[PDB]
């Protein structure tokens, strides 16, 4: 009752929405896969992996709010699920909840048998501790790609983007097919004012996962920072289209906020005619207008 389950869910009827959810993560994609996991969580609230998959899917679908709600259930149900802790650190970092982000990185580390034995204004000591534990882990294991991913998240939180991107760069050399890691390197680069480099990263991330809505929004953000509004427009049509798939009564607000960002770009680029048509909420005419479809 703390998670705003989607009312219009055909997956509630199904027999095996979890296996289906897991198929859709690769083959239909995130919005639909999330619905499937939503159905499993309603039915068997105690399935940690139902909550976990939902949370990671939601974050990938540009909804850290719901991700967090979801991952906190998984974290209560299995506190040694390191994937939930890593994801918690990412969503909180994105939502600027510093204390939680740092507690999720700590937990992520110390929940591993491998590493369990082990100034930043908002949380100087929480950060001191994290940086120390994580750097100690890195001399135990210099080539743990996920250790580098975590230093990357740590250093994002403290706006040390140079050091973050370095670690995330070592991370993608170890795991060059990890879309998650490419996005992280991408966001690090965008946020550190290296937007052309960011797009390179984001483009690797989309080649691995063409339904990765967070990456499409990120790309739009960077193209907008560089005032290339046509390119930005194109990525937000893809974003809006992909993030819905189905039909969505929290969710309205994610969709509308994205429509609003795109609409504002249409205003900025002098297309009053296209600005008005956003209110209708139909993406396809924009897909055609921005070279995406016939």
């Amino acid at each position: 009752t703390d998670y705003p389950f989607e009312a219009n869910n055909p997956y509630m009827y199904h027999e095996n929405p979890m296996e289906e959810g897991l198929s859709m993560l690769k083959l239909a994609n995130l919005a639909e896969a999330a619905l499937a996991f939503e159905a499993v969580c309603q039915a068997a609230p105690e399935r940690e992996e139902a909550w976990r998959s939902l949370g990671l899917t939601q974050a990938e679908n540009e909804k850290d709010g719901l991700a967090i709600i979801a991952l906190n259930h998984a974290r209560m149900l299995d506190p040694k699920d390191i994937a939930v802790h890593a994801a918690l650190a990412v969503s909180h970092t994105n939502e600027h909840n510093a204390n939680a982000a740092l507690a999720s990185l700590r937990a992520w580390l110390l929940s591993q048998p491998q590493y369990e034995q082990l100034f930043f204004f908002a949380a100087p000591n929480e950060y001191r501790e994290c940086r120390t534990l994580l750097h100690a882990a890195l001399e135990m294991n210099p080539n743990d790609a996920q250790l580098h991913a975590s230093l990357g998240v740590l250093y994002n939180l403290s706006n040390n983007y140079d050091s973050a991107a370095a670690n995330l760069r070592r991370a993608v050399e170890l795991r060059p097919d990890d879309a998650q890691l490419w996005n992280k390197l991408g966001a690090t680069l965008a946020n550190g004012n290296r937007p052309q480099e960011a797009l390179d990263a984001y483009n690797r991330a989309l080649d691995i996962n063409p339904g990765y809505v967070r990456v499409m929004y990120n790309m739009a953000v960077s193209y907008s920072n560089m005032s290339q509004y046509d390119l930005a427009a194109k990525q937000l049509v893809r974003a809006i289209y992909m993030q819905v798939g189905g039909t969505t009564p929290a969710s309205r607000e994610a969709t509308r906020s994205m429509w609003d960002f795109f609409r504002m770009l249409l205003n900025v680029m002098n297309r009053p005619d296209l600005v008005e048509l956003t209110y209708a909420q139909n993406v396809e005419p924009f897909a055609k207008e921005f070279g995406l479809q016939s």
Binding site: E62, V90, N94, N156, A190, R214, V221, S222, S224
Partner: peptide, 5 residues
């Protein structure tokens, strides 16, 4: 604007 990890 701010990018999301």
């Amino acid at each position: 604007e701010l990018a999301k990890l």
